[PDB]
Structures are given as C-alpha cells and as structure tokens.
C-alpha cells in the first residue's frame, strides 16, 4: 500500500490526507515527530527520491515529492483532474487561488515581526475570500456537483484563517455552508473524529503563528 | 489572438513568454508599466476574470489567472503535460522543484533584511541545483529528448540565481550547458535578441533584489 511521509503537523500535506480519506484508499503514514529531524536527514537521500523533500509519496508505480505533484497524482489516478484543457485549467486556477491564501499565512507565520505582517494579510484576505464566495454561489463544491482536490485545499485554508481571525467568514455565508458540507461527508466526519487526525500544529513547530506543541 | 497581461518585468510570467516563443504561437501582450498601477486597478474587475490577478491570459471564451494554470493550459493545448498519470506526475514534480528555487528568491527579494536572508538561501542553493545537475545525467532536457514547460521554468530560475550569485553554477557544468542549449533553440535565440525581450527587472521594480531599472554592469 502507498506510504505518505511528512512531519506530524498539518502543514503542506493536510489536503492530501483529506483527499485519501475522502477516497477511502488504504495508505501507511511515516510521521516525523518534533525531535526526529535526525531520523529524516539520515534517510532523506536513501529512498530513491529524485527531489528529496517532505512530504514524499511512494507506491508501486511512483516515488514523488512536491505536495502539488502528490495531490495531483492521487486525483489523476482517480480521473479527477478534468476532462479537457479548459476544465483542467479551471482546476489549476482554483489550486493557485487557494495557495495565495494558504502560502499567504506560511510566508509570514515564521517571522519575528509577525504581528505587523498580520495587519496587512487581514486587510487583503476579504477580497480573496469574496472570489471563492462568488465561485460557490450555486456550486456544491468548487467544480460543481463532484468533489475535486482543490475542495480539500480550500477547506484546509479556511481551517487555518479561522484560527488567525475567528470572524473572517462572518461576511461569507457560502464559505461557512461549504466548510460544513465538507465536514458532513461521512468518511471526512469519521476521519476528523479518529486517532489519525492531527489537529495541531498548523505550521512547523518553530512557527510564531500556528506553531508550538499545543493550541494557544 | 490570445492576450497575456502582466507587469513589464520578468517575474511570474517569463517562463510562459519563453514557452509561447518556443511554440511560435501568436500572442498579444498587455504590459503594465511602473506608473500604471492605476490603469490595472481600473481594468481588474472589468475583464471577466473569476479570480482577478496578474498575470492573466484571455483566449476568447478561456479567461485564466494563476501563472501555473496559464503555463499548464498552453502546454496542455499542445499535448505536452504527459501521456499517463506517472509522466504527468514527473512533470508536476519537476515544476515544484524549480518553483522552490524561483519562489525561494521571490519570497526574500521584497524583504528589508535581504542580505541576512540571502546567506541562508545560498547555504541551501548548491544542493537544490545539484538535484537538477543529477536529473540531466544522460538527458538533453528535464524530461529527456523533448522540451517541456519546466525546462523554461528552470532556464528562468538559472538566469535569476546567476544575478544573485554569479558563481553558483561553477560546480555544475551540465546546468551551464543546459542554459546554453536553451539559448541555442533558434526561436528562443531570435526572441532573446528581439525588442519584445524584457531583460530587467527580475522582480517588481520596488524589490530589494532584482528590482530597479538596469542590471549591475
């Protein structure tokens, strides 16, 4: 069965875990704890990876790194990437727009001067969320009636910005409805209640925002 | 014809430009100059873009933003993304590894403490480049005998890191050769010599690094 290797955090891989649980696919996790940086560095160059990094995904057919290449491969193997160039570009554009939010947090989350950079991010965040509000005006999910990988990426981004500002969705009822819809998927519900779910941290443990061993 | 809208810099879109020139595909550029922030603010919500942003690519019915969605769409229309899930994953992985170098530069280039952040980046860069040197063992391009979009992304990343550290490819002669090989593609050489080529800046004009109006002579 496939092996998914990452830090014991949400970070870059949480959307991939959510997709694997939505598809109900068997996989093994190799999790690196806060004190297992040495364990990772001594294995890193001996797994056959062409671009050694975390996370990594190893099945029969593939040895992958790059979080976007991994989530796209799992989608692609399930016929979820889109049927024609236009639909595939729509899905890649949604991907990018979600990363503008999720990388927007990560960019500033490890900085000494985080409190200053937060003011600016929370000023631009409304506009980014409005575009998703409009996309989800009459669509159950970002691509219509059927779930795609950017749904889990957006879920993860909403999870993270709600910690930084618990009122950030008060203006965005369609995003609140979308978020509850994801959570009501029976196999997502079971995952979120399971011993396998990693609630914290959001970033690397060293992060000034969404770090430490426990929520603040 | 397709419209490619961006700032008059290299930045996010330069690999897209190179790919269009490789394909010899006709396109028009809407180029926003340093003084045209107002021009853009005014047109931004008027173009029919679902996720308004720079760069944008407008192809009659197809209206796209996100640089990676744009370069992938152009590749996809020419059947260049990969024939099966495994080949499509190899191209996606190459794409991500190039972006770790290119975004690695962009994420510190707008910082006040660039000189401090540069030391940390240049202690990691030799190993990141080594992974590309190793991939080019017995290969003309990153995916073998045929050009793919990550080749133009790597070419762009190599141009940018050579400005930050002129010696960073001294240990990597297969990367020096790769960069010369791209520049010997005849439709690339023609573009690089033309009046359409934007040599500078690398980042937004306001950047601590790769910014301003001319390179250092």
CATH of the domain at A89: 1.20.1050.10
Q: What is the DSSP letter of B179?
A: H
Q: How far is CA A118 from CA A11, A108, A165, B145, in A?
A: 18, 8, 10, 47
Quick one: B49 and B73 in the same domain? Answer: yes
Measure the CA–CA gap between B90 and B139, rounded to whole angstroms: 14
Method used to solve the structure: X-ray
Q: Do B85 and B180 reside in the same domain of the chain?
A: yes
Looking at the fold, whether B96 and B166 belong to one and the same domain comes out as yes
**Are A89 and A108 part of one and the same domain?**
yes
Alpha carbon distance B5, B48 (integer Å): 13
B71 and B149 assigned to the same domain: no
B149 and B90 assigned to the same domain: yes
| Tokens representing residue B87 in the block | 């080949």
B17 is in an annotated binding site: no
Please tell me the distance from the alpha carbon of residue B7 to that of residue B16, in angstroms, as a whole number.
13
Range of the domain at B110: 81-185
**Residues A140 and A202 reside in one and the same domain:** no
Indicate which of A13, A47, A59, A85 best probes the interface with B, i.e. most B CBs within 10 Å of its own CB.
Answer: A85
Contacts of B53 in chain A (CB under 8 A): 97, 100
Contacting residues of B for A107, CB less than 8 Å apart:
107
Across the interface, whether the CB atoms of B73 and A64 are under 8 A apart is answered: no
Q: Which CATH number fits the domain that encloses residue B16?
A: 3.40.30.10
Cα distance between residue B76 and residue A151, in whole Å: 23
Does residue B79 have a known ligand-binding role?
A: no
CA distances for B70 relative to A89, B38, B66, B83, B122, angstroms:
7, 24, 6, 19, 30
Total number of domains constituting chain A: 2
CA distance B182 to B140: 10
End-to-end CA distance of chain B: 38
Question: What is the rounded CA–CA span in Å between residue B118 and residue B160?
Answer: 13
Q: Are residue A55 and residue A119 in the same domain, yes or no? A: no
Q: Are residues B132 and B193 in the same domain?
A: no
In a domain? residue B148: yes
**Chain B nearest C-alpha distance from A215 (Å):** 27
Say whether both B57 and B151 belong to one domain. no
Calculate ∠ Cα B130-B11-B21, nearest 5°: 85
Give the H or E element holding residue B7.
Answer: strand B3-7
Smallest Cα–Cα separation from B152: which of B186, B176, B179, B134? B179
| Cα–Cα distance for residue pair B179/B21, rounded to 1 Å | 16
Determine the residue of chain A that is closest to B86 in CA distance: A62
Same domain flag for A179 and A101:
yes
Find, among B28, B18, B35, the residue nearest to B189 by Cα: B18
Distance CA A1, CA A15 (A): 19
Cα separation of A103 and A160, whole Å? Answer: 11
Report the DSSP beta bridge partners of residue B28: B3
Q: Is B51 helix (H, G, I), strand (E, B) or coil?
A: coil
Chain A residues within 8 angstroms (CB to CB) of chain B: 50-53, 61-62, 64-69, 72-73, 76-77, 81, 85-86, 88-89, 92-97, 100, 107, 131, 134-135
Q: How far apart are CA B93 and CA B148, in angstroms?
A: 13
Spell out which residues of chain B touch residue A100, defining contact as CB-CB under 8 Å.
53
Residue B217 inside a domain? The answer is no
In whole angstroms, give the CA distance from residue B51 to residue A142: 13
Enumerate the residues of chain A whose CB falls inside 8 A of the CB of residue B70.
Answer: 89
Are B39 and B50 contained in the same domain? yes
């Amino acid at each position: 069965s496939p092996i998914l290797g990452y830090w014991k955090i949400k970070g870059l891989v949480q959307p991939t875990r959510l997709l694997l649980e939505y598809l109900e696919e068997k996989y093994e996790e190799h999790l690196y704890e806060r004190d297992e940086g040495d364990k990772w560095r001594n294995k890193k160059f001996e797994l056959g990876l062409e671009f050694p990094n975390l996370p990594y995904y190893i099945d029969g057919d593939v040895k992958l790194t790059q979080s976007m290449a991994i989530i796209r491969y799992i989608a692609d193997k399930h016929n979820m990437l889109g049927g024609c160039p236009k639909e595939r570009a729509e899905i890649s554009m949604l991907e990018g727009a979600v990363l503008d939010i999720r990388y927007g947090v990560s960019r500033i989350a490890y900085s000494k001067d985080f409190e200053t950079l937060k003011v600016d991010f929370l000023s631009k965040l409304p506009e980014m969320l409005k575009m998703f509000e409009d996309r989800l005006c009459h669509k159950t999910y970002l691509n219509g009636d059927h779930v795609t990988h950017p749904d889990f990426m957006l879920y993860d981004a909403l999870d993270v910005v709600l910690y930084m500002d618990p009122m950030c969705l008060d203006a965005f009822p369609k995003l609140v409805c979308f978020k509850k819809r994801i959570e009501a998927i029976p196999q997502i519900d079971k995952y979120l209640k399971s011993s396998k779910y990693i609630a914290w941290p959001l970033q690397g443990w060293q992060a000034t925002f969404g770090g430490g061993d426990h929520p603040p």
